[PDB]
Write a protein that binds this DNA or RNA. Structure first.
Ligand SMILES: [Mg+2]
Ligand SMILES: [Zn+2]
Ligand SMILES: [Zn+2]
Ligand SMILES: [Zn+2]
Ligand SMILES: [Zn+2]
Ligand SMILES: [Zn+2]
Ligand SMILES: [Zn+2]
Lengths: 261, 49, 48, 182, 157
RNA sequence: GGAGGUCAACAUCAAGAACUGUGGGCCUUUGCCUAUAGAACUUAUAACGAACAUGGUUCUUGCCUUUUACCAGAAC
RNA sequence: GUAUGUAUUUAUUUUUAGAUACUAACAC
């Protein structure tokens, strides 16, 4: 309210500043139809985002609010949006109310207004499935922190918690020491989508620590959709949750069914 | 050309342009001819590329 | 809610039928009932 | 003919409160999100002036088989996700009625063409030892909140605030082990 | 007949020079409009176009005020302008009509192009859209006619 | 109301040397005979165009390893 | 002066002489 509701959204990036198209020289000559490169294959192309968002600093009201649009600006989620208050889509982190508005249409398509596909994706890629509600993000390529080795995993854990923590209401988080991955889980599908598009290709530590000014040379961290949990514990936990929720909606079924007669 | 006539097509009354200009997607103006030649060259070159 | 159904004029240049694409399909054969096949050697092989 | 003739299947929910609606019909639209075959597409807008636009995703066949709504993909009657209604039904009886679906391509491209009608369809600084949404929610209403940490593998972790934390000390402990962290 | 000074073109009438500077400020701006200032976003592109349309409108409005309001110029200067494409004959003619005095363009009144019915919301008085807005209390979602950049051609606003 | 428009839609443009409507009589509506009114555009060294291109099938050739691309005549 | 084919995973998913020889876009 005092933070977001009143203060109108502020342009993240001047339009002249936005990255050019035509990513650089992955190949010999440029190609006009598809936008890629021609012959040969340069070392695989991926790079950290020059940009990031600042939830309380940037986010503010926009035109969609008055126009009552449902869907959130992804260029905001990337903090790359150049339209500022003129933008057609909402700038702010998803809350429970707005998910309340989306609730009918969240089934087929993500919070950004993009249709979901059926099968996920070979590598668990960009957008999810409309078969399975998946609230759990896989965080990987933790070398987005670059090569700094840390006193403990509480560095990784703590830092990640403080990263995603802003983006939405977190149900749980587990970093794994052995294989480098975080698993982060939210209340709502919406926050999961939004956070995934927000934190993909990002860096870490402090606005200035050590190698900070070289951050832009890093690879950036994969945020992908996460598979199930093989251990028996959380599997019980899911089975139970599904049970009690099934039970919960049986109440609706018998209330409107009772109204049916 | 005198020996083998053709005797054209009634119902030909429909032309490409009369059908084309009808839609939202085409707009009409005047312009210098040489400029239309140059535009059409750039059009073509983009098409074949 | 009733409805009113309305065609949209295509941009003549763009492909009409955006989704018509040659693809091959194996259809199932759905057999609901069976058609009885209803008809009415020894030394013969030595001939045949 | 074959593709047009079956009329669309739309819920009453997503189709909105408007009395009369104008919807567009494109005779070859995108393929299904499911079968991957062409079909006829329908726009519409709930409101006349609503900015958002509704686009039927799946076929008529691929819908009818599953008995769902083309815009929603929720059950045609109960307004339920498909992966649920078959779980409720599966609760009655014992183990069955899961909808087995079509990997590869012409597995699915094949499958949509049979008239089966589907399995589902036929019936229709304080350290605290011994989720996070609940803790942050309860502690959120009684005072100032800054961060929480829990490691469910350790079943215990911090709760940090920016006096008000002592206001929390009224109800915090045993509700729960809560002390003042180092 | 053409904008160009081609030898066939008859020289300017009398009253021309006085208004030549005012017209040149328009021309020199249209040069800057079509220079191809690149933009990635759609919104920015059709904004660029909106510039051109609005400039054209302003010029023809200038001349229309000269001849049909102040009568500050001769008929012959006027007709010579129209024949030299400094003005839009058809557009002016719409301005002379009763209801259209402030009009955008000639696209905005096209009945055929628009999907159902006609005449951009660009033509509907704010007075009303505020009212149908009032029924919903959603305020009003309209800002710019996609063809033009208009907000309320309608001659009440 | 008059003049127009490098505006649109809908009609019509190759045939008993050829159109349409209407009145009357016979057969039993069609059709035949008789009476009457009006016929824009296109036609006699024949045709909407005082102009002149291409394609398909089928034959006959011509180049000539074969296919596209072709040679030059005909019919549809 | 060989079509053509196969593979190209980097970013960490929860518990002592030589004879018989084979072949060589290398020399009529
Ligand atoms: Mg051969
Ligand atoms: Zn934005
Ligand atoms: Zn389908
Ligand atoms: Zn629906
Ligand atoms: Zn306009
Ligand atoms: Zn308009
Ligand atoms: Zn306007």
């Amino acid at each position: 309210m005092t933070s977001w509701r009143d203060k109108s959204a502020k342009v993240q990036v001047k339009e002249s500043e936005l990255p050019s198209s035509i990513p650089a020289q992955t190949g010999l000559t440029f190609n006009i139809w598809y936008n890629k490169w021609s012959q040969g294959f340069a070392g695989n192309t991926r790079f950290v985002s020059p940009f990031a968002l600042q939830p309380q600093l940037h986010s503010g009201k926009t035109r969609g609010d008055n126009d009552g649009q449902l869907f959130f600006c992804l260029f905001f989620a990337k903090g790359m949006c150049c339209l500022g208050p003129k933008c057609e889509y909402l700038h702010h982190i998803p809350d429970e109310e707005d998910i309340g508005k989306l609730a009918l249409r969240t089934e087929v398509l993500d919070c950004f207004g993009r249709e979901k596909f059926a099968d996920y994706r070979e590598d668990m890629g960009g957008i999810g499935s409309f078969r399975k509600k998946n609230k759990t993000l896989y965080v990987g390529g933790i070398d987005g922190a670059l090569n700094s080795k840390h006193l403990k995993p509480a560095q990784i854990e703590s830092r990640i918690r403080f990263v995603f923590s802003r983006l939405g209401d977190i149900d749980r988080i587990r970093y794994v020491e052995s294989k480098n991955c975080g698993f982060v889980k939210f209340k709502y599908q919406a926050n999961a989508e939004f956070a995934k598009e927000a934190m993909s290709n990002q860096t870490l530590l402090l606005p200035s620590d050590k190698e900070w000014d070289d951050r832009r040379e890093g690879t950036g961290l994969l945020v992908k959709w996460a598979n199930e949990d093989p251990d028996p514990a959380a599997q019980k936990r899911l089975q139970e949750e599904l049970k009690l929720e099934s039970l919960n909606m049986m109440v609706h079924l018998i209330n409107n069914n009772t109204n049916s007669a | 050309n005198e020996l083998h006539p053709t005797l054209p097509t009634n119902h030909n009354k429909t032309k490409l342009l009369k059908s084309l200009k009808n839609t939202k997607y085409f707009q009409q103006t005047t312009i210098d001819w040489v400029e239309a030649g140059l535009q059409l060259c750039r059009q073509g070159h983009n098409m074949l590329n | 809610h009733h409805i009113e159904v309305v065609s949209k004029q295509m941009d003549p240049l763009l492909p009409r039928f955006v989704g018509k694409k040659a693809r091959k399909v194996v259809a199932p054969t759905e057999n609901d009932e069976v058609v009885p096949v209803l008809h009415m050697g020894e030394a013969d092989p030595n001939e045949w | 003919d074959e593709i047009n003739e079956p009329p669309p299947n739309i819920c009453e929910q997503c189709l909105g409160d408007e009395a009369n609606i104008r919807m567009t019909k494109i005779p070859q639209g995108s393929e299904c999100k499911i079968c991957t075959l062409p079909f006829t597409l329908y726009h519409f807008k709930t409101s006349k002036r609503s900015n958002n636009i509704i686009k039927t995703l799946i076929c008529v066949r691929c819908a009818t088989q599953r008995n769902i709504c083309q815009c929603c993909m929720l059950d045609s009657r109960w307004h339920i996700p498909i992966q649920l209604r078959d779980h409720l039904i599966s609760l009655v009886n014992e183990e069955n009625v899961m909808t087995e679906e079509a990997k590869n391509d012409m597995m699915k491209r094949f499958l949509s063409l049979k008239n089966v009608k589907l399995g589902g369809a036929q019936i229709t600084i304080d350290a605290s030892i011994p989720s996070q949404l609940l803790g942050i929610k309860k502690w959120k209403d009684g005072n100032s909140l800054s961060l929480i940490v829990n490691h469910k593998a350790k079943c215990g972790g911090l709760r940090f605030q920016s006096s008000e934390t002592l206001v929390t000390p009224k109800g915090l402990k045993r509700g729960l082990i809560d002390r003042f962290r180092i | 007949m053409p904008r160009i000074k081609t030898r066939r073109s008859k020289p300017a009438p009398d009253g021309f020079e006085k208004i030549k500077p005012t017209l040149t400020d328009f021309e020199i701006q249209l040069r800057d409009a079509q220079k191809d200032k690149s933009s990635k976003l759609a919104a920015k592109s059709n904004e660029q176009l909106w510039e051109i349309m609005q400039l054209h409108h302003q010029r023809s409005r200038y001349i229309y005020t000269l001849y049909y309001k102040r009568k500050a110029i001769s008929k012959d200067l006027y007709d010579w302008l129209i024949k030299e494409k400094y003005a839009d004959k058809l557009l002016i003619a719409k301005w002379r009509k009763t209801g259209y005095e402030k009009l955008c363009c000639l696209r905005c009144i096209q009945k055929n192009e628009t999907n159902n019915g006609s005449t951009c919301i660009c033509r509907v008085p704010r007075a009303q859209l505020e009212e149908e807005a009032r029924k919903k209390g959603t305020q009003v979602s309209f800002h710019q006619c996609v063809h033009c950049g208009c907000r309320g051609c309608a001659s009440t606003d």
